[PDB]
Design a protein around this motif. Structure first.
Motif, PDB file in Angstrom:
ATOM      1  N   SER A   1       0.824  -1.214   0.000  1.00  0.00           N
ATOM      2  CA  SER A   1       0.000   0.000   0.000  1.00  0.00           C
ATOM      3  C   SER A   1       0.867   1.277   0.000  1.00  0.00           C
ATOM      4  CB  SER A   1      -0.975   0.006   1.172  1.00  0.00           C
ATOM      5  OG  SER A   1      -0.310  -0.228   2.401  1.00  0.00           O
ATOM      6  N   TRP A   2       1.764   1.436   1.003  1.00  0.00           N
ATOM      7  CA  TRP A   2       2.653   2.594   1.181  1.00  0.00           C
ATOM      8  C   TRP A   2       3.766   2.683   0.148  1.00  0.00           C
ATOM      9  CZ3 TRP A   2       7.435   4.738   1.894  1.00  0.00           C
ATOM     10  CH2 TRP A   2       7.553   5.932   2.616  1.00  0.00           C
ATOM     11  N   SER A   3       3.835   3.865  -0.496  1.00  0.00           N
ATOM     12  CA  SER A   3       4.850   4.265  -1.471  1.00  0.00           C
ATOM     13  C   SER A   3       4.987   5.805  -1.519  1.00  0.00           C
ATOM     14  CB  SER A   3       4.529   3.713  -2.861  1.00  0.00           C
ATOM     15  OG  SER A   3       3.285   4.197  -3.343  1.00  0.00           O
ATOM     16  N   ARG A   4       6.157   6.279  -1.977  1.00  0.00           N
ATOM     17  CA  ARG A   4       6.437   7.691  -2.222  1.00  0.00           C
ATOM     18  C   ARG A   4       7.424   7.831  -3.385  1.00  0.00           C
ATOM     19  NH1 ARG A   4       7.099  11.403   1.728  1.00  0.00           N
ATOM     20  NH2 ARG A   4       7.732  12.815   0.038  1.00  0.00           N
TER      21      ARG A   4
ATOM     22  N   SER B   1       7.584  16.836  -5.474  1.00  0.00           N
ATOM     23  CA  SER B   1       7.525  16.010  -4.255  1.00  0.00           C
ATOM     24  C   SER B   1       6.301  15.099  -4.299  1.00  0.00           C
ATOM     25  CB  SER B   1       7.504  16.889  -3.005  1.00  0.00           C
ATOM     26  OG  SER B   1       6.261  17.559  -2.853  1.00  0.00           O
ATOM     27  N   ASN B   2       6.280  14.024  -3.492  1.00  0.00           N
ATOM     28  CA  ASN B   2       5.175  13.062  -3.481  1.00  0.00           C
ATOM     29  C   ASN B   2       3.810  13.694  -3.244  1.00  0.00           C
ATOM     30  OD1 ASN B   2       4.620   9.933  -3.561  1.00  0.00           O
ATOM     31  ND2 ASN B   2       3.219  10.837  -1.994  1.00  0.00           N
ATOM     32  N   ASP B   3       3.670  14.515  -2.188  1.00  0.00           N
ATOM     33  CA  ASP B   3       2.396  15.108  -1.786  1.00  0.00           C
ATOM     34  C   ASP B   3       1.915  16.197  -2.769  1.00  0.00           C
ATOM     35  OD1 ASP B   3       3.094  13.453   0.432  1.00  0.00           O
ATOM     36  OD2 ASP B   3       2.346  14.908   1.908  1.00  0.00           O
ATOM     37  N   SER B   4       2.832  16.808  -3.520  1.00  0.00           N
ATOM     38  CA  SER B   4       2.497  17.834  -4.505  1.00  0.00           C
ATOM     39  C   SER B   4       1.889  17.199  -5.780  1.00  0.00           C
ATOM     40  CB  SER B   4       3.740  18.655  -4.832  1.00  0.00           C
ATOM     41  OG  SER B   4       3.432  19.709  -5.726  1.00  0.00           O
TER      42      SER B   4
HETATM   43  C1  LIG Z   1       2.156   9.886  -2.165  1.00  0.00           C
HETATM   44  O1  LIG Z   1       1.099  10.537  -2.883  1.00  0.00           O
HETATM   45  C2  LIG Z   1      -0.012   9.678  -3.224  1.00  0.00           C
HETATM   46  C3  LIG Z   1      -0.966  10.498  -4.064  1.00  0.00           C
HETATM   47  O2  LIG Z   1      -1.241  11.763  -3.474  1.00  0.00           O
HETATM   48  C4  LIG Z   1      -0.633   9.113  -1.948  1.00  0.00           C
HETATM   49  O3  LIG Z   1      -1.719   8.220  -2.209  1.00  0.00           O
HETATM   50  C5  LIG Z   1       0.452   8.420  -1.130  1.00  0.00           C
HETATM   51  O4  LIG Z   1      -0.114   7.920   0.075  1.00  0.00           O
HETATM   52  C6  LIG Z   1       1.604   9.384  -0.830  1.00  0.00           C
HETATM   53  N1  LIG Z   1       2.640   8.710  -0.063  1.00  0.00           N
HETATM   54  C7  LIG Z   1       3.279   9.264   0.979  1.00  0.00           C
HETATM   55  C8  LIG Z   1       4.182   8.352   1.752  1.00  0.00           C
HETATM   56  O5  LIG Z   1       3.136  10.444   1.284  1.00  0.00           O
END
Ligand SMILES: *[C@@H]1O[C@H](CO)[C@@H](O)[C@H](O)[C@H]1NC(C)=O
Ligand SMILES: CCCCCCCCCCCCCCCCCC(=O)O[C@H](COC(=O)CCCCCCCCC)COP(=O)(O)O
Ligand SMILES: *[C@@H]1O[C@H](CO)[C@@H](O[C@@H]2O[C@H](CO)[C@@H](O)[C@H](O)[C@H]2NC(C)=O)[C@H](O)[C@H]1NC(C)=O
Lengths: 272, 98
Positions: A15-18, A34-37
């Motif tokens: 499930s968890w990835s970045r 970045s991942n969250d952007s």
């Molecule tokens: C990375 O971004 C995706 C899409 O916004 C999200 O589903 C995922 O949980 C994020 N991962 C982390 C570790 O922040």
């Protein structure tokens, strides 16, 4: 000048990835993601290159679709074949083109798996590279079946990268050619031998990267001059140090000479 | 797994009482998970800026941590790194002379 989109992806579990990415043109960072952007950020005033806002949005949208599709694929590829060690997974992607004078360029798409060079893209397909675990042949065969994705990667390497990168190179030419002057300073550390001293010439704040730093006795270059690695500054100028091992008393008359493109021909000559 | 190399150096010539920038360049580590701290007299400096995680042609990871500092005759400065390739955190102290 090498244009390169560098992606760092980490899969901790099912499930968890970045995934985090940046774009560099030579030694200058032009983009950040970045991942969250959800959107790609410009780290330079010239990062849009010669693209129109409609052309940049189409390029950004492609990346947005790709990032979700990449994450989904690695996940699917892992689930379809439990490779004994399913997680943790570390992926590094490097894609772009090397810019050569005369509108000429050589495109690439390379992948490292668990820190080692694993896959490349040539012609129309993904190819496992020398050294990569052989079991990667199966997900490489699955990926190669998707001719649609393969055509986009072909578009990317043959059209998107050379055209976007030339425009980026043109808009960023003045920045890549700006001259920043080096500042030099000297120090010494007692060496692991009595009556032996290590002379240190510190050179910082210069741009572009090519530099010449040598310890001298007049016109005579001290062959014993050892150049360190190029170390970055936060402002994207460079730092370097050149050391010289000498016997105690031999320091007097020695100088550090630095040749840089920003000084004209007026070399820095700093005496001990 | 690859062990991180750490290099601590200043942006400008160091002069006691003159504000400057302390750099900590961490390289050659795998995987990219890393904890970097910059310390003044063994206590964590609160304002530390990090570059974005990037890597070299040979896939070697690199990151640059930097902070504003004022070198002094009595203060010690360090960069402490914690990485799974090491049993213990690695601390390398700033030495203006090295
Ligand atoms: C990375 O971004 C995706 C899409 O916004 C999200 O589903 C995922 O949980 C994020 N991962 C982390 C570790 O922040
Ligand atoms: C069991 C171990 C796990 C397997 C590891 C194998 C190593 C990885 C193999 C090589 C890396 C391939 C990169 C994956 C690309 C897949 C992207 C994709 O899925 O394609 C398009 C979407 O992607 C695009 O828009 C085009 C791709 C261009 C990518 C450019 C961005 C890279 C720069 C950061 C939609 O397809 P689907 O509907 O199947 O999901
Ligand atoms: C992108 O450029 C490559 C060349 O690097 C093209 O590759 C050729 O593709 C055909 C099939 O379409 C193969 O039979 C050739 O052997 C390939 N050439 C080489 C040198 O490998 C590719 O087709 C181009 N793709 C697009 C969509 O422009």
């Amino acid at each position: 000048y090498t244009f390169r989109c560098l992606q760092t992806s980490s899969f901790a579990n099912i499930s968890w990835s970045r995934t985090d990415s940046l774009i560099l043109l030579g030694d200058l960072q032009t983009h950040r993601w970045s991942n969250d952007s959800a959107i790609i950020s410009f780290t330079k005033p010239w990062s849009q290159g010669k693209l129109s806002n409609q052309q940049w949005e189409k390029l950004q949208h492609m990346f947005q679709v790709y990032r979700v599709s990449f994450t989904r694929d690695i996940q699917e590829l892992v689930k379809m074949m439990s490779p004994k060690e399913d997680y943790p997974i570390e992926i590094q992607l490097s894609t772009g083109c090397e810019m050569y004078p005369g509108n000429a360029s050589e495109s690439f798409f390379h992948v490292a798996f668990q820190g080692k060079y694993a896959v490349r893209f040539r012609g129309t397909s993904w190819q496992r590279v020398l050294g990569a675990p052989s079991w990667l042949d199966l997900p490489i065969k699955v990926l190669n079946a998707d001719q649609g994705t393969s055509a986009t990667v072909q578009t990317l390497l043959n059209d998107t990268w050379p055209q976007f990168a030339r425009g980026l190179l043109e808009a960023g030419k003045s920045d890549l050619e700006k001259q920043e002057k080096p500042v030099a300073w000297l120090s010494s550390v007692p060496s692991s031998a009595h009556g032996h001293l290590q002379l240190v010439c510190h050179v910082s704040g210069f741009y572009p990267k090519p530099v010449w730093v040598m310890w001298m006795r007049g016109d005579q270059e001290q062959q014993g001059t050892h150049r360190g690695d190029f170390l970055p500054n936060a402002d994207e100028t460079w730092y370097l140090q050149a050391t010289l091992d000498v016997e105690a008393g031999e320091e007097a008359g020695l100088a550090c000479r630095v040749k840089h493109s920003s000084l004209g021909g007026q070399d820095i000559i700093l005496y001990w | 797994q690859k062990t991180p190399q750490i290099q601590v150096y200043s942006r400008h010539p160091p002069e006691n009482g003159k504000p400057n920038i302390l750099n900590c360049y961490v390289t050659q580590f795998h995987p990219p998970h890393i904890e970097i701290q910059m310390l003044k007299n063994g206590k964590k400096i609160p304002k530390v800026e990090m570059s974005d995680m990037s890597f070299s042609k040979d896939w070697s990871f690199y990151i640059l941590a930097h902070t504003e500092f004022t070198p002094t005759e009595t203060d010690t400065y360090a960069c402490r790194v914690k990485h799974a390739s090491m049993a213990e955190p690695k601390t390398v102290y700033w030495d203006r002379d090295m």
